[PDB]
């Protein structure tokens, strides 16, 4: 993508999203990041949707194959999909480390990128067989939590999605279901108390993510 204009990459990412061509969408957004300029809010969302969909298909496939696994063919093919998943997570982590996080000074950008760092170390942990990868996810989520608590209101959708994902990290990855349940409860309750401050459209944005926290609390208790 080095020969393509930044604006054309961004335009084609949006076309690829409409076409449900998520591998193309992630390749266009990788090329836009590698132009070296910081991303706007809408561009950071495009980067995240593209990779979420790519890695989401790889995670689903890896879970089907790992279940069948429980000749060498099932293990070889699960290994094949696992390696490709690890490569996509390494690519995202590499964009964050060169140089999205270091250039991100506003809280909205910095928390978004540190949450992504946590997420893609978490996806590495889901397949790992591990301590160091779990620690790297934890450390990224904790830095993002610290900034979000100081800099954003409790209803901010990035803060809420970070706390949701850190709660899933604690329940599924770190074997800390009580920490998961405490974080999801505290986050839901502090957001409920701040909803009165919001417009109708912001209220809809924040209550949609709060419902996910509640859906997990209903699964966990």
């Amino acid at each position: 993508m080095g020969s393509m204009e930044r604006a054309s990459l961004i335009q084609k990412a949006k076309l690829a999203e409409q076409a449900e061509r998520y591998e193309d969408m992630a390749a266009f957004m990788k090329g836009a990041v590698e132009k070296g300029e910081e991303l706007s809010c809408e561009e950071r969302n495009l980067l995240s949707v593209a990779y979420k969909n790519v890695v989401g298909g790889q995670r689903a496939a890896w879970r089907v194959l790992s279940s069948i696994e429980q000749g060498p063919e099932v293990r070889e093919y699960r290994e094949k999909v696992e390696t490709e998943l690890q490569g996509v997570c390494d690519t995202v982590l590499g964009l964050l480390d060169s140089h999205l996080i270091k250039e991100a000074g506003d809280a909205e950008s910095r928390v978004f990128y540190l949450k992504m760092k946590g997420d893609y170390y978490r996806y590495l942990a889901e397949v790992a067989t591990k301590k160091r990868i779990i620690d790297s996810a934890r450390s990224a989520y904790q830095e993002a939590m610290d900034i979000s608590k100081k800099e954003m209101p409790p209803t901010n959708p990035i803060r809420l999605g970070l706390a949701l994902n850190f709660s899933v990290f604690h329940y599924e990855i770190a074997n800390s279901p009580e920490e998961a349940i405490s974080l999801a409860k505290t986050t839901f309750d502090e957001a409920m108390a701040d909803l009165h401050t919001l417009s109708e459209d912001s209220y809809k944005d924040s209550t949609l993510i709060m419902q996910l926290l509640r859906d997990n609390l209903t699964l966990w208790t």
Binding site: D119, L160, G161, L162, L164, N165, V168, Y171, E172, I209, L212, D215, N216, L219, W220
Partner: peptide
């Protein structure tokens, strides 16, 4: 298993 953020 447990829904994460959109």
């Amino acid at each position: 298993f447990y829904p994460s953020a959109e």
